[PDB]
Structures are given as structure tokens and as C-alpha cells.
Design a protein around this ligand. Structure first.
Ligand SMILES: [Ba+2]
Lengths: 185, 151
């Protein structure tokens, strides 16, 4: 399983993304996205952070939403604690501060098996979204779907691309995975 | 019972190794430093020598009684203080706290709410950069100390 190893290369120069994959057959002048590596999550360029200078101006709440989604919460009091130079410190914390211990994390679920497997049997995305939200408090952000249907003839690779919030009537392949904002594990 | 310099102008102590006064944050906090003089020294391991003697020498004049001496403590790089100790070793009540002075834990350790003065000296090699960016570290330290809170 040499090619089945999930790895995320970080690119200092985005133009190098073309060299990450050989079966992409994409034009060299294509932008950073729309390229098979970046569109599949295998590549990541620091240049994206530069664009975060724009949105953080246009949307005041963009950066604080990004940090909550990303850094595990990174409460301001935590970098006040780290500002004291003593480093990250703490012990067996009281349950009062452990109340925020069960917050909303981002994870992936598989439609191959589980309580949501029926929606992978030709179901629609909206049905899965409403059912998950009503039954488990799970917010389906988007889909992680095979580049070509994994039948070993269409494409024998485990390559998947991301679809951010597909429409209501999006068909659901049984092999598709779902990004979720799951709460309480 | 007070040992002075041969000229009789300054207080004096026998030469001692650096570790005879070197302290960590626990030891610095244990010592109840009050009305002392903190010296936030921004220096590199190979930054040019500035002669901290000339800062502590006027602090140790013989016209001050021994109990009137302000206990000078230096928070800064440790190799630079190794280089400076050859000249600094003869002054009593001196102390050393290694590590950067921008680190708030150091300033908590060497009580800076209680210090009589907090000198901020930068011994780094500057003026080869933009002139307005020359004193970035000193201004940052001043703002950091002014923004702290104590009990
Ligand atoms: Ba290519």
C-alpha cells in the first residue's frame, strides 16, 4: 500500500503543486486550486494564509471562526497564560472548567457502515443532513468523494476530492465520506 | 567589617564564580528583592561588550551604607553575562537571572512591581537595520512591562 499512505505535503511555492501528482494531466498555468493535489487535500500552500488577510478585513468574524474551527478553541486566556512565559501549565483541572471539555470538533464519518449507511445506498445529501442533525446533532459540512468511482476499473486509486456543502439533492455514493461538526464525540 | 576597593570609593567583595550569584526563577522569587534595580539586558552570546560595570559601579559607591545598597539584578543572556562577570564579580549584592527579559516569568520572579528602577539596555548589534527598527526590543520590553499586572 505504497500509494495508499495518506500524506499532506505543504508547499512553500504553490507552482510546485503540479509535481505532486502525475495522473492529474493539468495545465501548468492553472491556479493553486482546481489542481488535483490541492483539490484532493494532499497539497497545501502557505499562500492561502495571504488570502486570509483579505477575508479577515471584509468579514470581521472570519478569523475568530477559523481559529475556533481549527486550533481546538485556543481561548484568549490560553495565550495570556503562555504570555506569562511559564509555558503551558495545568493539572487535574476542576469539572467547572471541564464543562467546555465537550465542544464541537470536526471529524469524518463513512457512509459504508453505521447508522447512516442507508443514505449511501443511492440516497440524497439533504436527507442525510437533516437526519444526522435531528438524530445526533451532527452538522454535515461537505463531502469527501472518490475522484472516480472506486471500482478498480474506473480508478484503482484511493484519491478523493472535497465538495463543500453540495446541493440538497446531491446523490450519495456508498463510498463517500462526510465532513461533520460532531459534538460530544 | 566592610571590604572596600583600594581607592576607598566603592564597595568590594572577593572574586567569586558566576554561579555564586547565578539564580533561577525559583531562587529569585525566594529572595525578597525590594527597592532593587533590575537590568533588562538584551544581548547575544557574541554581542559587543558594553561594560555593565559602569552601571553597577556608581551603584556601589562607598558613601552608601551597605544596607543602603540597591541589590542590582541582571536579567539577560547568560553567555554575555559570563563575559561580563570578569569585571562584575567584585561588586556586592549583585545577582544574575539568565534568560530573555521579555519573558514575563522572569519579571515576575525578580519582583518588578517592587523594583526601584528597571533599566532596559540593548547590547545587540543594531543600526545595520532600519533606523526606526533599531530599538524594537527596548520598546517592546518597555510596553510589556507597562502592560503587566500584579497583586
Ligand atoms: Ba502534473
Amino acid at each position: 500500500a505504497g500509494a495508499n499512505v495518506p500524506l499532506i505535503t505543504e508547499l512553500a511555492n504553490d507552482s510546485n503543486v503540479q509535481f505532486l501528482d502525475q495522473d492529474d494531466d493539468d495545465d501548468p498555468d492553472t491556479e493553486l486550486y482546481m489542481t488535483q493535489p490541492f483539490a484532493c487535500g494532499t497539497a497545501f500552500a502557505v499562500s492561502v494564509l495571504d488570502s486570509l488577510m483579505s477575508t479577515s478585513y471584509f468579514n470581521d468574524n472570519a478569523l475568530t471562526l477559523i481559529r475556533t474551527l481549527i486550533t481546538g478553541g485556543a481561548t484568549p486566556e490560553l495565550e495570556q497564560i503562555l504570555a506569562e512565559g511559564a509555558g503551558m501549565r495545568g493539572g487535574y483541572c476542576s469539572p467547572a472548567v471541564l464543562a467546555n471539555r465537550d465542544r464541537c470538533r470536526v471529524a469524518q464519518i463513512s457512509l459504508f457502515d453505521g447508522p447512516l449507511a442507508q443514505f449511501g445506498q443511492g440516497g440524497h445529501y439533504g436527507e442525510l443532513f437533516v437526519y444526522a442533525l435531528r438524530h445526533f446533532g451532527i452538522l454535515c459540512i461537505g463531502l469527501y468523494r472518490f475522484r472516480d468511482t472506486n471500482e478498480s476499473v474506473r480508478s484503482p486509486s484511493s484519491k478523493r476530492y472535497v465538495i463543500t456543502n453540495p446541493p440538497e439533492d446531491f446523490p450519495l455514493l456508498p463510498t463517500d465520506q462526510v465532513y461533520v461538526l460532531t459534538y460530544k464525540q | 567589617p566592610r571590604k572596600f576597593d583600594s581607592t576607598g570609593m566603592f564597595h568590594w567583595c572577593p572574586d567569586r564564580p558566576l554561579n555564586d550569584c547565578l539564580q533561577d526563577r525559583s531562587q529569585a522569587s525566594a529572595s525578597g528583592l525590594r527597592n532593587h534595580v533590575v537590568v533588562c539586558l538584551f544581548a547575544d552570546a557574541a554581542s559587543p561588550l558594553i561594560g555593565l560595570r559602569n552601571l553597577v559601579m556608581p551603584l556601589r559607591a562607598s558613601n552608601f551604607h551597605y544596607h543602603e545598597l540597591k541589590p542590582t539584578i541582571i536579567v539577560g543572556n547568560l553567555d554575555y553575562l559570563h563575559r561580563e562577570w570578569k569585571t562584575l564579580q567584585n561588586f556586592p549584592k549583585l545577582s544574575i537571572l539568565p534568560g530573555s527579559p521579555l519573558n514575563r516569568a522572569n519579571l515576575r520572579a525578580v519582583n518588578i512591581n517592587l523594583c526601584d528602577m528597571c533599566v532596559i539596555v540593548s547590547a545587540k548589534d543594531r543600526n545595520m537595520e532600519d533606523p526606526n527598527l533599531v530599538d524594537k526590543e527596548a520598546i517592546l520590553c518597555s510596553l510589556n512591562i507597562k502592560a503587566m499586572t500584579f497583586d
